[PDB]
Amino acid sequence: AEFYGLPNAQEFWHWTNALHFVLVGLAGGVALLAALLHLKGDAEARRYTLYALMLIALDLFILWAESPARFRFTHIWLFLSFHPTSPIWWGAWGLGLGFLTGGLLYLGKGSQRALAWALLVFSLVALSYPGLALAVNLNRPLWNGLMAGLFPLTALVLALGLAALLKSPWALFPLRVLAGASLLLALLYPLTLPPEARGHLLEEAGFWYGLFLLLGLGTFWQERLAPWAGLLAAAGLRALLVLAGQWQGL
Amino acid sequence: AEFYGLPNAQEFWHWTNALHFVLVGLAGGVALLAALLHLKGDAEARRYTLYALMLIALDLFILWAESPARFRFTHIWLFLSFHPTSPIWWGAWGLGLGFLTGGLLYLGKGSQRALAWALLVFSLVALSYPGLALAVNLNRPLWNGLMAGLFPLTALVLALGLAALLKSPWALFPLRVLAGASLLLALLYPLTLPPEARGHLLEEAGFWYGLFLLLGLGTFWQERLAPWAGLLAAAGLRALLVLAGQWQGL
Amino acid sequence: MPRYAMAIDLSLCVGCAACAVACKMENEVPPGVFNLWIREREVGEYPNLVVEFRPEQCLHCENPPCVPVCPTGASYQTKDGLVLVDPKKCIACGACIAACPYDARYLHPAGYVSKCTFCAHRLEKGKVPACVETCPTYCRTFGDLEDPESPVAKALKAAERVDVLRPEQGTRPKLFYLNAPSKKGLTRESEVH
Amino acid sequence: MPRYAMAIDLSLCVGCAACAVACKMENEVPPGVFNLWIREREVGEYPNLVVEFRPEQCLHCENPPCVPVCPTGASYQTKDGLVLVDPKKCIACGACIAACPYDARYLHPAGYVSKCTFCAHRLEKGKVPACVETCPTYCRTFGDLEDPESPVAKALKAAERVDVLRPEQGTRPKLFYLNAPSKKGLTRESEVH
Amino acid sequence: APWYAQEVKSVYQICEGCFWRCGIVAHAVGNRVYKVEGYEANPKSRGRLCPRGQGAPQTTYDPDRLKRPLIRVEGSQRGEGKYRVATWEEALDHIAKKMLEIREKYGPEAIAFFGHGTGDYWFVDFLPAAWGSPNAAKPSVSLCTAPREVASQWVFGRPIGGHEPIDWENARYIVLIGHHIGEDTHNTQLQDFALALKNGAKVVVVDPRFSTAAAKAHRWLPIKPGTDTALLLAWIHVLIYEDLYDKEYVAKYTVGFEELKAHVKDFTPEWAEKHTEIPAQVIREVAREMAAHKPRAVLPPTRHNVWYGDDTYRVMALLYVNVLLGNYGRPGGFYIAQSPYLEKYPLPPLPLEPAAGGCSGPSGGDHEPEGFKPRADKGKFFARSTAIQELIEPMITGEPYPIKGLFAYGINLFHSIPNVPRTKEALKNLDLYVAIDVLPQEHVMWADVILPEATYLERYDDFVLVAHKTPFIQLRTPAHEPLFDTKPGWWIARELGLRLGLEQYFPWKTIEEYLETRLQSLGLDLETMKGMGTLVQRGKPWLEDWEKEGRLPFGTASGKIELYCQRFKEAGHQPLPVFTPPEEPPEGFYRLLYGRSPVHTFARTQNNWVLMEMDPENEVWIHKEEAKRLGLKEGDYVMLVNQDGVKEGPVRVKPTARIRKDCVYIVHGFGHKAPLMRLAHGRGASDNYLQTRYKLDPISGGAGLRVNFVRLEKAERPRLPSLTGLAKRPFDER
Ligand SMILES: Nc1nc2c(c(=O)[nH]1)N[C@H]1C(S)=C(S)[C@@H](COP(=O)(O)OP(=O)(O)OC[C@H]3O[C@@H](n4cnc5c(=O)[nH]c(N)nc54)[C@H](O)[C@@H]3O)O[C@H]1N2
Ligand SMILES: Nc1nc2c(c(=O)[nH]1)N[C@H]1C(S)=C(S)[C@@H](COP(=O)(O)OP(=O)(O)OC[C@H]3O[C@@H](n4cnc5c(=O)[nH]c(N)nc54)[C@H](O)[C@@H]3O)O[C@H]1N2
Ligand code: SF4
Ligand code: SF4
Ligand code: SF4
Ligand code: SF4
Ligand code: SF4
Ligand code: SF4
Ligand code: SF4
Ligand code: SF4
Ligand code: SF4
Ligand SMILES: [Mo]
């Protein structure tokens, strides 16, 4: 209760690393739309493959921009070591091989639709890694097993929300299905925590939490409200869980 | 290591109950289908309601026929008290009231959209209670937070898989989206566990687990294998987590 | 008004299941189940060899996870700190078994769930529990935690160390272990092999 | 080939912060961050007042959660049991800070993660750490766990009791608190509120 | 539904759980004892009870418990299990008719009487002497206590007794030699040992195994087996040569102390460390520490002492160390135990009377010209006690005359006497073999005539007298009437006694008639005795109380420290030099050590469902590093094979270290081959079936058992019935 000096219990991932969490949701979700649109033969497979390349690149810039190690150029090691136990390592390659693969597909060369199978795999790795980068830390009570489920569900709500605003006929229905799955697990999450962890969550966020749950109920009303209301709900929850879970707590 | 007498650490939920677990998934998810159908004003809303009633009856009958207190007639207390903190209490009221609500819908008595929204809310209570009946036991390392995510998504793969065998046209696309979600979260599940618990799941099960993960991949292949494969993966996964997770273990 | 508890001195316990047999007899606990058992574990090599003898049974937790999870209201906590079951409401659903972190409860063959009762039948008529009375070594003590004179209160006051099983669940057990033999504390299966 | 460890006898720690200041001077640790800090907590009520003075720092865990989590490989565990950071490969991502259960890690203002180092720079020239050297009360000891002539080894043997922070976690902390002042062991914030 | 809410009837009753005979209260509801409890005034229980005492009542409510007399079908072999139901009248006639025939062509000494338990007074002490046979014996003499009783009679003039006389409450330093307290679960001594620890009593344990009592010790000396007399001689040497002994005490109460100092000259802590394997510094430190605490330092003598052939020497040496410390009769470790006063029932003297020997000719003087035929083991060892294991040979060869006919009153022929094959040959050759018991064990079903006894809760027994600090008398009253066709032992004895001309002995027409006569003597009657279950009398415990009266206790007027002028003379040696290096295990083998389970009594509790459910099998203890070289792990099973090829049923392996690499250990009493005791049949390994050989103590009739070696052979897990299934069979009094 009293200290000489202080434990290093200060926030470590700030509002900027909560912004990247939202964009890699989009980047991975759209890369999934693109490969599936390929595999299916669809006329739109190209439009969506060059978007995913921009979203992926925007994120990889924000990832270096926000790193205090940027002008020391140490990121080359992310690609020169084998580290399978590391969620973040798996996301460096998943977004890197996912880029090259999406390049060799947009420049119609190298190879066709055997390459859409590789884009499908790399997009699943990019959709899976954040969720596990949090849940892997068993010392953080709030970041439980549900993070590995709440993040991939929520990244597809972001990709289908974007797709529906660029008026693609197919996007609305699956966005309202994954948005229902997303919102129901988000409601059950608090009931899954021990009493002290839940109490911490309701005093720190919540309103904010219960706001984004209510806001998300807007995907099931009108259009041009729908993709917006589901998009703000998915990014709310994603940013708030990264911000409120950096607690170690007894 | 050695005992005089023994601790009561034996299996409390049998193959009998794991069956109840696969069934309440079907029951709840078909009651969601009947609700959403009455809500679009679609013609099939009538017979889906008969089925959700049948599966609700079949599930209450085996919950009672498997109870050690089946002839002591004490289940009446489930209905004469208020226990909001208990998943099994929530489950008894959701199914029960969901069976009256769906009873009046079938008999065109006591209103009709205001009864379809009710069936919607009671079918969300019944889809939600199983994963929480597991997940609230924070002493059992395998029943972590993801159980609140794995159980709702898997009850949907069961209902939609059934709807597609009965040849309903709308369901073979939602069945593939929801089966992709369930199999992705099921694959990341073991990676969400402390080392010793993952090692315990792998020794006691897995090979069954890994077989259920492959199986479910046939939901994206040949048209009429797709519902069988999706049904067996979702039911195998539910029963395996119920039998293998009854461990306190240090 | 009292807050009921039990204290066992492990420095005196020799693991002769006397208490375990006395409870079996006094409470008519059927053959395949037990309210009380003894665990025995050795720790270490030649020149530092310790043996821990440990009786285990309902700890009558102050914050019992075995109560809120019950659908009917059969599972309940008393005003003095006793955790009990009203068999008249019990549906034998096993929710309380899933929730107890100590393997303290079982399905009795009469169709309802059972477990250590702190000998509520003897407590009500002013007697001490069966385990406490039959005990050659005098290592168990019982009483009101709030009375400075009671045998448990005294036992805790005179102890060199005090421990409780799985303290990190947050159940607040009311069965206290005194003077554990090993320097590192109560023995766990995880600190083996 | 040895197993490096630190032991702190809490029956002698008075929480003066000498070790903490000796560390800051030696490793020129920058303002606002600490390799070592002291925690002081009272367990209360008059006839029975207890104060725990507890120095905290990297425990150089034997099964460190901060190593596996690193994408670069800058977080490595040595052949004798020191957890260190090679700043040449560090991308300052914080994954290790997220996985450390003890708040022992910080972002250095020069753009890489830092923490106590078991005074690696002194261990190679055959010297004892700076905090161990300055200690007025003779309460901290160091050495190879496997060599029985070691000052850690002899102290572990002489201790009345041995404890570690968050044992329930996977880690196997290699910083041992010896004679804890409260009978219930090391003080926790949940045991207050 | 609960028993305590239902109507109850209590009674003051003795526990027949084992021979400690604790005073208990039994709570019955109708024809069934639901609970039993200790009681405060009683000096043995004082309110507490061990596990065996608590579970003891279920044998009375066991569906396999023996109910009717039975006679062996004519023409069927003993062993084969063919019987036909009989009447008490018919079975009792058949026995007397047969007994009388053996007596007309051989004499009455051709009938051996073996027995154990409370009613052994009738079968082993009374009936045999009234009939005229000196061949009466119990296993608690040559298979237990003989070595120490003989050592004690020679050194002091007194026994050690059934309730060993240790002043535990004032003891300050205690040394246990093989004495396992906490596994051996005798009530009062568990209580006392626990109270000593509690008051700051530091305990040293000497044992090749890290036992329960060692788990409570300040020092554990892991001694090489069969080597204790070398450690005792070297401690005797340190107290005499470093001049630490109690000088006065030896000067006023000790004869021949000089012979001892010279004998022990070369037995030094360095000579001891060589055979013992305990470092010389440790041997020295332990003797100094015990000298620093006198007279409040004690080496209490253990109960089971047959270990090796030399045994009386080891105990004599342990007793010298106690004498040298000045503790006998002083508060610290030995109080002086006097027997209570309860006058015998008036009768004519018995044809044969006993000789509680110790000095001046207690061997065969009355056996040579004195009337007609001496106990059949008369020339085999020095001491005068009857040895159960030596009178078995006379039944096979007819050597010392012939013993046709044998009685077994509650004594396990196949588990308590070594060399089971030899005992089976001997039953083959008999003209008559009767067994009185309750359960259908493996040795009861080899009998011509089986008689079902009534159990301790359905029976009255002659009083139980206990020598003690405060001598006392106990009385057991039925809690309810016998079940089925069951009869008490006092009744069975009298009924046989009237049939063989012994009416002057057995005159009284009933046991309460008998009990009223002894209560007249003391100043009470039957109803008042039932009122205060136990009776405490005045006696004495120190030396002052004796001394001020102008007397001392003993044998001959001063404890003789070397200890016995008449053995010296005609036997050979006086002192305990027989440290006699022990024969060692052959390579590939281990010494077979054995002992008690806190929850099971000897062999008789293996069919008890309340107790088998706490401990369903035994487990073999091997050092962690040996089970590893062999290819054995935690849940494996194994067969134990002895140096003579005998195999003992599959046993679980226990690879946890608390034992030397020289040895292996198993609890005694498992391995039953008795199909009719449905839950004890086929479980664990029997130590007795592996104890094929034994080294005869030439001084105290004892059969040294720890002389057998065993090796382990990988076996399959056993397939057995479910214990819960069997335990659930309902009890029907028909
Ligand atoms: N191999 C080996 N032999 C030993 C020992 C050992 O450790 N190993 N220990 C030795 C020692 S120390 C002792 S003291 C002796 C004890 O030896 P025993 O007393 O012979 O041992 P138990 O195995 O209990 O056998 C008791 C027998 O009496 C029967 N019985 C029990 N209660 C009653 C009753 O009320 N009435 C009647 N009629 N019968 C009853 C039981 O069914 C059983 O047949 O054995 C000695 N023998
Ligand atoms: N639960 C229970 N308790 C009982 C009984 C029962 O049947 N059940 N029976 C009672 C009776 S009648 C008796 S006689 C006793 C028997 O019990 P004890 O009288 O205590 O027998 P001991 O043979 O002295 O002790 C057994 C110990 O002796 C050890 N030992 C073996 N060889 C040697 C050696 O060479 N040197 C040394 N120092 N130790 C050695 C073994 O390792 C074991 O740890 O217990 C009595 N109490
Ligand atoms: S009765 Fe006493 S010695 Fe026996 S198990 Fe219980 S606490 Fe331990
Ligand atoms: S088994 Fe009985 S006591 Fe336990 S939760 Fe169910 S109804 Fe309640
Ligand atoms: S020990 Fe078991 S029965 Fe008692 S409060 Fe805790 S969980 Fe409930
Ligand atoms: S207190 Fe009651 S329930 Fe607990 S062990 Fe004793 S008799 Fe059994
Ligand atoms: S030198 Fe000792 S007393 Fe001072 S802060 Fe360091 S550990 Fe605490
Ligand atoms: S901050 Fe540096 S040491 Fe820590 S995980 Fe990232 S790269 Fe590894
Ligand atoms: S205390 Fe934390 S930072 Fe230090 S080695 Fe252990 S897990 Fe890593
Ligand atoms: S070992 Fe070195 S770096 Fe660690 S706290 Fe001590 S002085 Fe600081
Ligand atoms: S010591 Fe135990 S088993 Fe023996 S008579 Fe006494 S209570 Fe019964
Ligand atoms: Mo004995």
Enumerate domains of chain E plus CATH numbers: 1-67 (2.20.25.90), 68-142+384-455+480-503 (3.40.50.740), 143-348+541-575 (3.40.228.10), 456-479+504-540 (3.30.2070.10), 576-734 (2.40.40.20)
CA–CA gap between residue B118 and residue E49 (Å, rounded): 64
Nearest CA in chain C to A195: C170
- Is B181 in Cβ contact with A178 (below 8 Å)? yes
Nearest CA to ligand 8 atom 6: D93
Residue E82: strand, helix, or coil: coil
3-state SS record for chain C: CCCEEEEEECCCCCCCCHHHHHHHHHCCCCCCCCCEEEEEEEECCCCCCEEEEEEEECCCCCCCCCCCCCCCCCEEECCCCCEEECCCCCCCCCHHHHHCCCCCCEECCCCCEECCCCCHHHHHCCCCCHHHHCCCCCCEEEEECCCCCCHHHHHHHHCCCEECCCCCCCCCCCEEEECCCCCCCCCCHHHCC
Q: In chain B, which residues have their Cβ closer than 8 Å to the Cβ of A149? A: 146, 149-150, 185, 188
CA distances in angstroms from E564 to B7, D92, E148, E410, E560, listed in the order given? 57, 89, 15, 36, 7
CA distances in angstroms from B82 to A140, B95, E242, E424, listed in the order given? 34, 16, 82, 72
**What letter represents residue E107's amino acid?**
G
H/E stretch holding B91: helix B87-106
* Cβ proximity of E142 and E392 under 8 Å: no
**What letter represents residue A220's amino acid?**
F
* Cβ proximity of E192 and E160 under 8 Å: no
CA distances in angstroms from E733 to C28, E10, E67, E557, listed in the order given? 19, 21, 10, 59
- Is B74 in Cβ contact with C91 (below 8 Å)? yes
Contact residues for E510 (Cβ-Cβ < 8 A; gap 6+): none
Q: With CA atoms as reference, report the closest residue to D40 among D58, D50, D54.
A: D54
Tokens, residue E73 = 């079908």
Sign of CA dihedral E681, E686, E688, E690: positive
Domains, chain D, ranges and CATH? 1-63+116-187 (3.30.70.20), 64-115 (3.30.70.20)
Nearest CA to ligand 8 atom 5: D70
Tokens, residue A126 = 């990019």
Task: Judge whether D165 is closer than 8 Å to chain C, CB to CB.
Answer: no
Tokens, residue E535 = 């009776």
Nearest CA in chain B to A192: B145
Ligand 3 nearest-atom number relative to CA E182: 3
* Cβ proximity of E48 and E189 under 8 Å: no
Experimental technique, in short, is: X-ray
H/E stretch holding E647: strand E647-654
Nearest CA to ligand 4 atom 3: C75
Spacing, Cα D20 to ligand 10 middle (Å):
8
Nearest CA in chain D to A92: D71
Q: With CA atoms as reference, report the closest residue to B49 among B8, B104, B3.
A: B104
CA distances in angstroms from E402 to A191, E77, E130, listed in the order given? 86, 21, 20
Spacing, Cα E692 to ligand 8 middle (Å):
70
Q: Is E608 exposed, middle or buried (0-12, 13-18, 19+ CB in 10 A)?
A: buried
A→B contacts (Cβ < 8 Å), by residue, are 124, 127-128, 131-132, 135-136, 138, 144-150, 152-153, 174, 177-178, 181, 184-185, 188-189, 191-194
Spacing, Cα D114 to ligand 8 middle (Å):
9
Write the residue in B1, B2, B4 that is nearest to E599 by C-beta: B4
Q: How far is B155 from chain C (nearest CA, A)?
A: 21
Ligand nearest to the CA of E138: 1
Write the residue in A1, A9, A88 that is nearest to D93 by C-beta: A88
CA–CA gap between residue E6 and residue E3 (Å, rounded): 5
Sheet strands side by side (includes E297-298): E219-221, E202-206, E173-177, E297-298
Residue D189: strand, helix, or coil: coil
Q: Which of A182, A188, A198, A213 to mutate to test the interface with B (most CBs of B within 10 A)?
A: A188
CA–CA gap between residue B163 and residue B157 (Å, rounded): 10
Expressed as residue numbers, the domain containing A194 is: 1-250
Q: With CA atoms as reference, report the closest residue to E22 among E118, E111, E90, E158.
A: E118
Task: Judge whether C189 is closer than 8 Å to chain D, CB to CB.
Answer: no
Ligand nearest to the CA of D75: 8
CA–CA gap between residue E392 and residue E422 (Å, rounded): 8
Which residue bears the tokens 């030596």? E390
CA distances in angstroms from A128 to A32, B149, E177, listed in the order given? 12, 15, 67
Nearest CA in chain E to C41: E656
Tokens, residue E94 = 């058949």
**What letter represents residue D83's amino acid?**
V
DSSP state of B216: H
* Cβ proximity of E682 and E365 under 8 Å: no
- C-alpha triplet E310, E316, E321: angle, nearest 5°: 130
Q: What are phi and psi of E75, to 5 degrees?
A: 100, -15
Tokens, residue B150 = 């794995």
Write the residue in B1, B2, B5 that is nearest to E613 by C-beta: B5
Nearest CA to ligand 3 atom 6: C19
Residue E434: strand, helix, or coil: strand
Strands (E) located in A123-246: none
Residue E486: strand, helix, or coil: coil
- Point out the annotated binding site of A for ubiquinone-1: 20, 129
Q: E–D contact (≥3 CB pairs within 8 Å)?
A: no
Q: Specify which residues D42 forms β-bridges with.
A: D51
Resolution limit, Å: 2.4
Q: How far is A129 from chain B (nearest CA, A)?
A: 10
Is residue E340 reached through a cis peptide bond, with omega within 30 degrees of 0 on the bond before it? no
Strand D175-177 and strand D4-8: the pairing is: parallel
- Is C71 in Cβ contact with B92 (below 8 Å)? yes
**Which of E315, E318, E596 most suits a substitution to test ligand 2, by most atoms within 8 Å of the C-beta?**
E596
* Cβ proximity of C64 and C77 under 8 Å: yes
Which E residues 5-64 touch C at CB under 8 Å?
Answer: 5, 34-38, 47-51, 54-55, 57
For chain A, give the number of residues.
250
CA–CA gap between residue E308 and residue E708 (Å, rounded): 10
- Is D105 in Cβ contact with A8 (below 8 Å)? yes
Please list every protein residue whose CB sits less than 6 Å from any atom of ligand 3: C 8, 13-19, 38, 55, 135, 137, 139-140
Q: Is B195 exposed, middle or buried (0-12, 13-18, 19+ CB in 10 A)?
A: exposed
CA distances in angstroms from D59 to D36, D101, D103, E570, listed in the order given? 11, 10, 11, 75
D19-22 contact pairs (CB < 8 A, 24+): D19/D55, D19/D131, D19/D132, D19/D134, D19/D135, D19/D140, D20/A4, D20/A5, D20/D55, D20/D131, D22/D130, D22/D131, D22/D133, D22/D134
Provide DSSP, A161-181: HHHHHTT-STTHHHHHHHHHH
- Is E656 in Cβ contact with B4 (below 8 Å)? no
Residue D131 annotated as lining a ligand binding site:
yes
CA-atom Rg of chain C in angstroms: 17
CA–CA gap between residue B128 and residue B147 (Å, rounded): 10
Q: Specify which residues E653 forms β-bridges with.
A: E620
Q: How many domains does chain A have?
A: 1
Please list every protein residue whose CB sits less than 6 Å from any atom of ligand 7: D 8, 13-20, 38, 53, 55, 135, 137, 139-140
Nearest CA in chain C to D184: C162
Task: Judge whether C15 is closer than 8 Å to chain E, CB to CB.
Answer: yes
Write the residue in A6, A134, A139 that is nearest to D34 by C-beta: A6
- C-alpha triplet A101, A107, A113: angle, nearest 5°: 55
Q: In chain A, which residues have their Cβ closer than 8 Å to the Cβ of C170? A: 194-196
Query: What CATH number should be reported for the domain holding residue A137?
Result: 1.20.1630.10
Residue A53: strand, helix, or coil: helix
CA dihedral in degrees (E173, E179, E183, E186; nearest 10)?
-80
